[PDB]
RNA sequence: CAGUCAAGCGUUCAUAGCGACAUUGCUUUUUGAUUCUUCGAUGUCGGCUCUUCCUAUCAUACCGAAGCAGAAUUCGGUAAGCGUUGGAUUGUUCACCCACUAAUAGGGAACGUGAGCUGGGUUUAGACCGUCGUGAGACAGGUUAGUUUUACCCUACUGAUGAAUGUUACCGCAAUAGUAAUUGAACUUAGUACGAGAGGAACAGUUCAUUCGGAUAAUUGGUUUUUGCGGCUGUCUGAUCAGGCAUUGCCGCGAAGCUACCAUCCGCUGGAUUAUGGCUGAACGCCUCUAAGUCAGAAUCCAUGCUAGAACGCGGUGAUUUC
RNA sequence: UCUUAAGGUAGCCAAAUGCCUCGUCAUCUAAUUAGUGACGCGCAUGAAUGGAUUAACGAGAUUCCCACUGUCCCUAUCUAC
RNA sequence: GAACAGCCUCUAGUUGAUAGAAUAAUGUAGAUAAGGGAAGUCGGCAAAAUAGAUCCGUAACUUCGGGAUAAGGAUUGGCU
């Protein structure tokens, strides 16, 4: 017979299976729609996520009851050293699909980039591209042969980039490599600026801008195996329930006589691959001068980082993207930054954003003051201050 | 509640579920007003119509002169004592639940508040504002 | 943006950050964060509470500012 | 539940909306009829929970017809994409009220679902009452108390490894499978269109909000074995200092972690179509949206997106073992 | 008038006893097949097959109110095994 | 401390219960939780709230014996 009363069920279908993402580190999907007329960009940037803090803003937005006042909003902090691209690879169109050609890197690989092709790198030879650089080290021997197969063949270019782990505070010393699809110009044009860019750093101020939308693409934040309360969000059974009370009560009719796919069932939770979208870019700021986190108000001189550094990540004395809200994967996490799909304005989008004032309290408790300078100010003279 | 809704409100943390007892802030002789429905609210299973700051509701008299008693009424909630997050990033509360009681437009039965109004509700419903003191 | 003081701990409060009371007498009180929140709702003396701005005033302490 | 015919009702104006007499069916959500399976047992009502399916569509999308003026409404088409609530009483299915709402539509899945729960009722044994019996006792008559057992096997489902295309590593493609967003209010349009007046709509717009979903912990709130700091009681360590014990002794704060529509962020645009309205245009020298051809067009479908990645589907690339 | 041996008296009642029945009126609630009070042509109440009442008492059976709370909105977190 | 209550200790006795590895889901036992406060449910089932002692005050009804710790309130430490 029927449900007595209806209701919505419960989690999405269209996000399961619930496993574990093939990788810590996740892909862009799919890269935007190519347009031959703009010229050669990167389409997508890697980052790795620093922490969250607060910025405080006047909201513009023409016709709202409460507009030209200021508001606090939640940004999320990821640090973006430069990537480093190297290498460039081409893609064919055919009926299976976008089939690659062929890869070309460059002279001089990194020893981190060298460290993620490895896995056990201090108990090795170190051998890894001295044959593809004796196939290179010369002027015209065997790359710029795979240069015109690119050209004449791979109507898609996605050049091949690696992230500044040394740069970052982690402790990592493995760099993430991944790809970029240049969407400008022609083929010819796009394997000329990866030629160009071959073994150089690309800036994240360079690729994105203030006041754009963007989405994040990360793999969220593992917490292993769950049952069906918190992980589906079914309703928990009465105090006097027999033998458990966290679980789905009926998981199927009798007939079919089968456990039906679409019954929430306990599992992993978490760690999963998630591409969200229409984040806006608060501030693209630079770790080579102080006053990161000052504004055309505050005017204070103060870097993003908060008093002690982020918790659990350190210092972001590189380049740094404040994005609005909360993005998937948690701190010391590889992002992928990518050009939106699709334009649109919606009075949200177009909306240039002017900062006031970025919260640079401690996150390690309910930290009450910015900088240093200002708790000593407040405090006045210590015990241990002499 | 239509034409004497003043705009529309950001969404404020509910805290007066259905029969939750508020003061009543009015001098209209009531003393406490019983919730038992929330204009606007949702359709979810088993979940209860939860009022909040400045919402209009459906409303009995427990306590209270004999003629407010035994009837239904409309009534506008003015303090919510449930903290609510403002768009400038403050959580603020009160002391206490409170309301009024109105009619379906949205006129007060009262002629004054005893105590404080939240700015939304003000916001939202310009004679409560008039018959406030002190809006918060 | 401004900055505030604790009603309780006469603490610079920054946006987002800390809580906002309304009492029955309409007086707002701006708390840092929980613990002062707590402590008002003890109803504990701030000249009394040793770590608190108005007790270092009241005790003429830190008089160097 | 749905057709056909049309005597009539609809102020003269059969079928806008109904429709007698009659008649043709469909439906297995009613109750009968039957006794085919099960009496070396298929756990029996209701509720809770959860998924999916049907359409005979209550609401939402786009339309056609009114005794459609406007505003509500009524009839019907495509259409099950998306929703269909909170309660008082009752064990209740069903009911009947209070309300909210866009709506509070009808059903199936062994009258879905008891090794999922509960046991209120039926449905053993105790007991009371009323009637019936001379009695023992009977009563789909009322009342009260009345053990709800087992999964570690196979499959299904949810996740997780994993041998074997020379090994190993990196970067990818995308067959297939799934898929998601939804509804309302307010301001302007506009006291305008319409209307004798009462009354009184749609916007290409702007701001919010229910409902659902995916994340996240900057902030707020919650949690405390941080047994982190402090306080307190009883006792013990001769006194202090410092501690032990009291299922974590109790109390106040309490970072970090986890977490809440109790917090915040985010949730895409293109094509092809249904109904329907049209173009050209015959059949049928006229007419005709149709016969050929063709335009627009739905919350529909398929893609763009999003999730998984075939462990027997693949590509490119680095290195590939001196005594 | 029929009629029995007498024809239900005092009391009580939709009562643990009333089928119709969720009886009718009032109250309790916003809403009550529940509860209480009242009414009785009471299917089929009733006087030691004891009737009515009753302070105190009850791990007896129903209703309401105050307080209180994760029973619930709507779940979250901690410890030991 | 009112107490062969509970809690700690002296004499005496034991240190016996298969062990090891920071513990995922669901359990068993123990607990907290903002705002609301029974809206849950057949039903306040289970939990919470109350609680000792000294003062103040204590209703209907009653078989005058009770109800009664009715209901409600206020204080409680240490030191001299």
Redesign the interface.
Known sequence: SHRKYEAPRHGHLGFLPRKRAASIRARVKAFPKDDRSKPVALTSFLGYKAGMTTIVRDLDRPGSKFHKREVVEAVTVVDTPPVVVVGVVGYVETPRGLRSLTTVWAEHLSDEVKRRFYKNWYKSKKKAFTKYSAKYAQDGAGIERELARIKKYASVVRVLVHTQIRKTPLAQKKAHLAEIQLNGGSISEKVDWAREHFEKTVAVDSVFEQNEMIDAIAVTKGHGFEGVTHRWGTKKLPRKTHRGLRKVACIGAWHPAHVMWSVARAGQRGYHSRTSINHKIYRVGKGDDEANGATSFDRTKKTITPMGGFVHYGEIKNDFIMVKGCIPGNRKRIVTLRKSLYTNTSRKALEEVSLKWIDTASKFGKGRFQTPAEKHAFMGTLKKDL | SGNGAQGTKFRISLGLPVGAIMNCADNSGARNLYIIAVKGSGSRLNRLPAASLGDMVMATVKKGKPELRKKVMPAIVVRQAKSWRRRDGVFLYFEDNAGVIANPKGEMKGSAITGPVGKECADLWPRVASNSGVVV | ?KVEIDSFSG??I???????????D?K?FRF????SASLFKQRKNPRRIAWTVLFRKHHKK?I??
Not at chain 3, 14 to 24: A, H, I, K, Q, S
Not at chain 3, 32 to 35: F, G, M, P, T, W
């Open positions: 943006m603490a610079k920054y946006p987002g950050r800390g809580t906002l009371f309304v009492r029955g309409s707002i840092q964060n929980s613990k830190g160097t500012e």
